[PDB]
Amino acid sequence: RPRFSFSIAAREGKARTGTIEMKRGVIRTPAFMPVGTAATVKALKPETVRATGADIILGNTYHLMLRPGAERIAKLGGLHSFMGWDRPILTNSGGYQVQSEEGVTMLSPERSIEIQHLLGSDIVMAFDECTPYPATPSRAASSMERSMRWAKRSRDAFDSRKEQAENAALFGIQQGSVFENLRQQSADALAEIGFDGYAVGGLAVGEGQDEMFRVLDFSVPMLPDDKPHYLMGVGKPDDIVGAVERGIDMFDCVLPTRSGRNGQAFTWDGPINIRNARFSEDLKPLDSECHCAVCQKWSRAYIHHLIRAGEILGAMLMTEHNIAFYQQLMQKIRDSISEGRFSQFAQDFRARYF
Amino acid sequence: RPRFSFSIAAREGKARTGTIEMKRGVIRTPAFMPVGTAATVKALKPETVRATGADIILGNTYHLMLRPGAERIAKLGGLHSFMGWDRPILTNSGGYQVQSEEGVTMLSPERSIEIQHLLGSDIVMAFDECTPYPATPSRAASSMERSMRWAKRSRDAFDSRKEQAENAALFGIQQGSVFENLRQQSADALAEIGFDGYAVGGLAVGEGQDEMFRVLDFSVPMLPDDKPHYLMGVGKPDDIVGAVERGIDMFDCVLPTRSGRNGQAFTWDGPINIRNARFSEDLKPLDSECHCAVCQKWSRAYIHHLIRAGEILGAMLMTEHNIAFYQQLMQKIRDSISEGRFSQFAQDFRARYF
Numbered sequence A, B: 001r002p003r004f005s006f007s008i009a010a011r012e013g014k015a016r017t018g019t020i021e022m023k024r025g026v027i028r029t030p031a032f033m034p035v036g037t038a039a040t041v042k043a044l045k046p047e048t049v050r051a052t053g054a055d056i057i058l059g060n061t062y063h064l065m066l067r068p069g070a071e072r073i074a075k076l077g078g079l080h081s082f083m084g085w086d087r088p089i090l091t092n093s094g095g096y097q098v099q100s101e102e103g104v105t106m107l108s109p110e111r112s113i114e115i116q117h118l119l120g121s122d123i124v125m126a127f128d129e130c131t132p133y134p135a136t137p138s139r140a141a142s143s144m145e146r147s148m149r150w151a152k153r154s155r156d157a158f159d160s161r162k163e164q165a166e167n168a169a170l171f172g173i174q175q176g177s178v179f180e181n182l183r184q185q186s187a188d189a190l191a192e193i194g195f196d197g198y199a200v201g202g203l204a205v206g207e208g209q210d211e212m213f214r215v216l217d218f219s220v221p222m223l224p225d226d227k228p229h230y231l232m233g234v235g236k237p238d239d240i241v242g243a244v245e246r247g248i249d250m251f252d253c254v255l256p257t258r259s260g261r262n263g264q265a266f267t268w269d270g271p272i273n274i275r276n277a278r279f280s281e282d283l284k285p286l287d288s289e290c291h292c293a294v295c296q297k298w299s300r301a302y303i304h305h306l307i308r309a310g311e312i313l314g315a316m317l318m319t320e321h322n323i324a325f326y327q328q329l330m331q332k333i334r335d336s337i338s339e340g341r342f343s344q345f346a347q348d349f350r351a352r353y354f
């Protein structure tokens, strides 16, 4: 197993399916990464996370930087050991959740990269400035330029550290707001520095699906075709399908977990609010076709009662189902792309989903 | 499999070990019943409850009477089906958590018994009045007398209902506060009416272990030897050991679950507060010898972080460990009684535990 290898097995238009091989395992693309807020995927054991099909999880750096702090986790063996997940982990840089050229008061590109190293990240994100939406062309440019300088410092910091450089991968992040010329300049700078993967940053921050898809339309072709394309913070099932149609390989979102705990369940016929009185005596599973263990064993009526009663098992079951749903979605995307029927899949999906 | 069969395999002094056979399964005695507050054992899937060794759970009636109410659960197939636990369930009568000769305003003996039927209880508790502690002899007597009349009405109500009478068991509850003559009168009345099992009520309500053990000393021999003896609401590991020494066969308590969520873990060397700073970098499992899955896989330091962070996985892991601990305790009790070394076990236990 190499440090990092991305291989594309099949394509359909801009859509791709393939694999990322890393020392800790293989990642099927297009991939959905369950988000791990504070060294845990909320309300699930990692074995359950794995059981639903996840190949990789996202380790949120922000909360851990502060508690228990990255040096203690290092001391204890690294995040993998700590939380009991032995497969790849993608870590964020911490800046999103958190100002000068050096960094953010004190987190700078160098420190973010070190913290991700201390955590034992497999995929390290460059430290950037995610431009607020909307942004004037001037601010978007200044932000993007800074992020590209921070992008270079991230690379150098990553490269300085032998063990990191030899066992982990580094992804760069494109910025530029909604402006084509900036996105292109950003793509060029990132390509020039060179990364194992390229994220599309600055989206999923208030623009609406229509605008997001439009920026993806011109932005994703700007990134090296031969490397994974990661859309940060996205999103709804229909967001994901449309972004794959636009060439995105990787996703993360708190929706399935967080929405799960609030009572929202994803189904092929669209999302439902299990708290709604209409489900009080409904003996059907959350979704008719879902193959997850929750859907094999418990009814809507039971999960309705649990969530309304504030019971922890309610959060557990809703969360397991939602993450399972998302992975089933990703599998459906992968299969349909391999088979050259992804466009039909996307239309069929949106037709039933809405 | 019969409706109810209690068979004693071995004895040591007042201690006994054996089995209760019921249609939904076999129960190893002395038995600990995890408590199911609102159609769930908080933060655990029933398969996990089973995996830790529980043979039977306690279904709390009180919360369900109100929501979702016993008729809806009936409609949905009964509690077993609803929460996914196919093994025996002992239901309380609801009165403890909740005044006239008819009942409590409106829950009476007849209604409690019907509600337990609607839930599909395997072991039905007679509706009583648990005497506050301390009580004057006069009040204790009046309370006990009422409970015995309610005990008779419970039996008749249970017996009126064919399906209940043929598939479920009924336990009576001894009262009498700390007074020998009352306990005896109560034992006699209950024996006279006749039950499948006898609980010792009125304890675990403020008296302190010393007083409780003293009342058990004279009270448990008053109950039919050939039927299970259930100490309601007890308790700490050392409570349980001493009560088995006094002839108790059955226990329930919220301690392992509730204490678990608050950060208290049970160990053979006594209880610990995993929140304590001293466990921040402790890579040992919660307990050195515990065979549960939590202790096989996660460290004290990790569970320390989770509980402090308010994470749901923290409640899940603490709860799984504690219930596992309790079942291991019960297994140790059973084995040592069979082998005629329970007294040594109890001394060894208390020696290390304190």
Ligand SMILES: CNc1nc2cc3nc[nH]c(=O)c3cc2[nH]1
Residues within 6 Å of the ligand: A096, A128, A129, A130, A131, A173, A200, A201, A202, A203, A204, A205, A232, A233, A234
């Ligand atoms: C939920 N939407 C969303 N989450 C994001 C996280 C990000 N991190 C780094 N850089 C980003 O541009 C960025 C954009 C994001 N949008």
Ligand SMILES: CNc1nc2cc3nc[nH]c(=O)c3cc2[nH]1
Residues within 6 Å of the ligand: B096, B128, B129, B130, B131, B173, B200, B201, B202, B203, B204, B205, B232, B233, B234
């Ligand atoms: C935690 N202590 C405790 N929980 C109890 C529940 C009870 N239910 C019915 N009857 C009782 O006498 C009774 C006594 C109890 N003590």
Ligand SMILES: [Zn+2]
Residues within 6 Å of the ligand: A286, A287, A290, A291, A292, A293, A294, A295, A296, A321, A322, A324, A325
């Ligand atoms: Zn499901």
Ligand SMILES: [Zn+2]
Residues within 6 Å of the ligand: B286, B287, B290, B291, B292, B293, B294, B295, B296, B321, B322, B324, B325
């Ligand atoms: Zn354990």
